[PDB]
Design a protein around this ligand. Structure first.
Ligand SMILES: Nc1ncnc2c1ncn2[C@@H]1O[C@H](COP(=O)(O)OP(=O)(O)NP(=O)(O)O)[C@@H](O)[C@H]1O
Ligand SMILES: Nc1ncnc2c1ncn2[C@@H]1O[C@H](COP(=O)(O)OP(=O)(O)NP(=O)(O)O)[C@@H](O)[C@H]1O
Ligand SMILES: [Mg+2]
Ligand SMILES: [Mg+2]
Ligand SMILES: [Zn+2]
Ligand SMILES: [Zn+2]
Lengths: 431, 431
């Protein structure tokens, strides 16, 4: 009985579900974040190698055996489980194939798991140039001492890789394996990026520390629609792993703490016998970016969705942000939307009425302190509480009020709070 | 060098890009419509077989060799070309796998190409029950005289099919091959449909001649959001192949002719050195379903998209429909949307201003015949011209005014117009 075949055109096909390029990037960040990899840092960068513009993703997580690498370069192999409260966001076994092939036509992955090293090629131009009618994935293995195991399939694989990748020679290729600093980790290089006329779909020159897009669905565009730095900073509700973008760490935040005048409420849907936490407050940065932030398994699905009175006109609920994690809804479209079900519609309706009650309540509370014709939208605001992530242990710590300009690196030992001045103290509850 | 593998979980994964179930159905209609199959009729029905509720799709097109069937049950094999002005809508090599697996977990296809017969199984429950780690596709071949060729792979295939499909025995299975009436054709049966609690995601009982859904994106829902019969009737701008749904033919229409007070204009985008045809008029059926119908390669992508003054409020441009085919835009999301590019945004903006000019012009023209406080939205209207499809040759014919109740079958010989009373006369130009 014959195997279902997989034509290399399908590497392109499979990538077309990413219309916004940052959803492809988020697939690669998600893989380093997930608990089976459990990386502490991921580095994203632009480099030039062999006169090609290149995207690299390097993490210091657990790495892969040569076999799991072949599963990563295959379709539908996903077996992620929760590990000590850290639930995986991946589950379909497609994020790397569709994401990498959306950013470029060719990708190579170097991985060390401590006891071994492997490198794999997933390359549309390679499959084109050899006129393949199946997708084949050259994989070569190495050991602790830099010698090739499974030489059987490693010979033809190495021949293909040296001829048809960016590395002409074997030690240039093993040079990437050393760019993974510690004992364990992985490194992905993507080239033949998507171009329009001449230059790339991304804008690397406008800001040396960002990747930018030269507005979707639509108001003014929130920064996260066109700045990778802005998108990374809200991608995770409570971030663990850190993101370093072109050498400068991304100021990820505890999104549920980034607001002013915070009120905590709960949603009690009838279709579900659980209660759901909701947080409302005012944006502090730019009163023009408001609406609901919707998360699923700690990952951002929809940002700045206007609800309640914010749909009627641009005079009402301006500045009001709501934050909810909806694990009862179904993410779709590469975790950029929810299935438009009845439960979705009821949640949106309830969110809108809670938003309305919060906003009217806030107008009233404001009117007991400030002038009556002064709109609450317009009072200058800073976060009710400022929380910072330790750069050593990645715990989140609450700082005392008034602290604005924090160093780029911060450690529990810098903490003015003597109760939380050592990395062993468990995180404080957000309440 | 190892082949990239394909895990059976990926049959589910690959299907999740269909959120609206009718987009899965349209993938199967599209395959019968395309010029390499070139079917004249497709039959869609609900039946019960072996106590399972079943969806069947039967067409009288060209059928498949045993090999192309294996390519259809594989990923990314697509080589469709235009044939005498009939351009294929398919191009990604995924529509059947993602569509069929969205409707049910298991599908079987019977096909005759005249010189042969084959049947293939693509079945999630089969792959589960044998604990497969690869997707395998049992295919067995037959000849003109009902004898098995390529017996090598036909033995194990037939064993799997008889055990793990709806047909216990070999002549029950060859009974489906005979349900394909003529010499050439194909028949697809899908079972283990998607259920919610007990019953299916579709509603077969509410209307014996329709498949219904028990509103998307949002006004009132157009019928095409929840009635397969309504959706099929507008799926193709100029239909060729006919659709018979649960035994009753779908009244497909020449969509560009279904309007009243038609004005023809052209769009002259600067980013493209072609002109683009546009038709505006008033809906005749239900003044509540209006906006732009957007087609791509004769296939409907977006229906009832409000533009221009129709976005400002529900008082303006009510009833106004526009029809445009945008082959310069990029369909996405299984041909249910366009990539949200700059060209898309400029087209939407130009459509809106042309819509505004048409509507104001029509209000003025109306005010020279009817009372001034009578809204043009409200005058009763019938199509400017009625066009009917010959049931023998599938050409479209213009009928003289006043003809309302046409038979269910109609032929060029019924034509009151003596110039167009025989199937050999080429179609009249739409102007
Ligand atoms: N940086 C990485 N380091 C180690 N393992 C990885 C890494 N990236 C991916 N993997 C592994 O490759 C497998 C496939 O990744 P992927 O294609 O993204 O599917 P998935 O994450 O399991 N589910 P999904 O993202 O929703 O499609 C994952 O399950 C991981 O086990
Ligand atoms: N009813 C049918 N009769 C004969 N051939 C068919 C039929 N349906 C599908 N095929 C063939 O199966 C192949 C794969 O179909 P499909 O998976 O829908 O990909 P595609 O139509 O080529 N492109 P796309 O629909 O955009 O993914 C098609 O290219 C056809 O050659
Ligand atoms: Mg993933
Ligand atoms: Mg198709
Ligand atoms: Zn610490
Ligand atoms: Zn005729």
């Amino acid at each position: 009985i014959r195997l279902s075949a997989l034509c290399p055109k399908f590497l392109h096909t499979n990538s077309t579900s990413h219309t916004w390029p940052f959803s492809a990037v988020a697939e690669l960040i998600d893989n380093a974040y997930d608990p089976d990899v459990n990386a502490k840092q991921i580095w994203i960068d632009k480099t030039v190698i062999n006169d090609h513009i290149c995207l690299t993703f390097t993490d210091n997580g657990n790495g892969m055996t040569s076999d799991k690498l072949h599963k990563m370069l295959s379709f539908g192999f996903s077996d992620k489980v929760t590990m000590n409260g850290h639930v995986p966001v991946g589950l379909y076994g497609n994020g790397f194939k569709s994401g990498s092939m959306r950013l470029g036509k060719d990708a190579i992955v170097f991985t060390k798991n401590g006891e071994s090293m492997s490198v794999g090629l997933l390359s549309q131009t390679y499959l084109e140039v050899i006129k393949a009618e199946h997708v084949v994935v050259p994989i070569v293995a190495f050991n602790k001492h830099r010698q090739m195991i499974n030489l059987a399939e490693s010979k033809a694989s190495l021949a293909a890789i040296l001829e048809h990748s960016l590395f002409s020679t074997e030690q240039k290729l093993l040079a990437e394996l050393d760019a993974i600093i510690g004992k364990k980790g992985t490194r992905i290089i993507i080239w033949n990026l998507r171009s329009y006329k001449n230059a790339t779909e991304f804008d690397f020159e406008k800001d040396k520390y960002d990747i930018r897009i030269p507005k979707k669905q639509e108001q003014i565009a929130p920064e996260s629609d066109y700045s990778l730095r802005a998108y990374c900073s809200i991608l995770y509700l409570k971030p663990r792993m850190q993101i370093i973008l072109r050498g400068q760490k991304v100021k990820t935040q505890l999104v549920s703490k980034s607001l002013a005048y915070i009120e905590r409420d709960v949603y009690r849907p009838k279709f579900l016998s659980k209660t759901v936490r909701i947080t409302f407050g005012f944006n502090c940065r730019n009163k023009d970016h408001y609406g609901i932030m919707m998360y699923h398994r700690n990952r951002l699905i929809k940002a700045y969705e206007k609800v309640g009175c914010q749909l009627r006109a641009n005079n009402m609920g301006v500045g009001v942000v709501g934050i909810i994690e909806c694990n009862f809804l179904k993410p779709t479209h590469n975790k950029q939307d929810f299935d438009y079900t009845n439960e979705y519609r009821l949640t949106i309706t309830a969110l809108g009425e809670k938003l309305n009650d919060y906003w009217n309540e806030m107008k009233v509370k404001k009117n007991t302190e400030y002038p009556l014709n002064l709109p609450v939208e317009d009072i200058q605001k800073r976060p009710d509480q400022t929380w910072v992530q330790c750069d050593a242990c990645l715990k989140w710590r609450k700082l005392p009020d008034g602290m604005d300009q924090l160093p780029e690196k911060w450690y529990c030992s810098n903490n003015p709070d003597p109760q939380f001045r050592n990395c062993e103290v468990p995180e404080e509850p957000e309440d």
